């Protein structure tokens, strides 16, 4: 055992990069999915105003 906890110390900075690359992984993932909500939310709101815009110039006529 003084094998194994002598070189857990030594693998730990390889601990630290392992979580903190999931982490990011995991943040990443986020960004991604609030990146498309927004973009869905752009898409949306130009086909509301898209018609408000039909309806508008069908005034006119």
């Given at each position: 055992?003084?094998?194994?906890?002598?070189?857990?110390?030594?693998?730990?900075?390889?601990?630290?990069?392992?979580?903190?690359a999931?982490?990011?992984?995991?943040?990443?993932?986020?960004?991604?999915?609030?990146?498309?909500?927004?973009?869905?939310?752009?898409?949306?709101?130009?086909?509301?105003?898209?018609?408000?815009?039909?309806?508008?110039?069908?005034?006119?006529?």
């Amino acid at each position: 055992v003084r094998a194994d906890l002598q070189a857990t110390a030594l693998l730990a900075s390889r601990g630290f990069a392992l979580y903190n690359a999931a982490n990011l992984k995991s943040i990443d993932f986020h960004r991604r999915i609030e990146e498309k909500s927004l973009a869905q939310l752009k898409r949306q709101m130009e086909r509301i105003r898209a018609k408000q815009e039909k309806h508008r110039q069908g005034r006119v006529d």
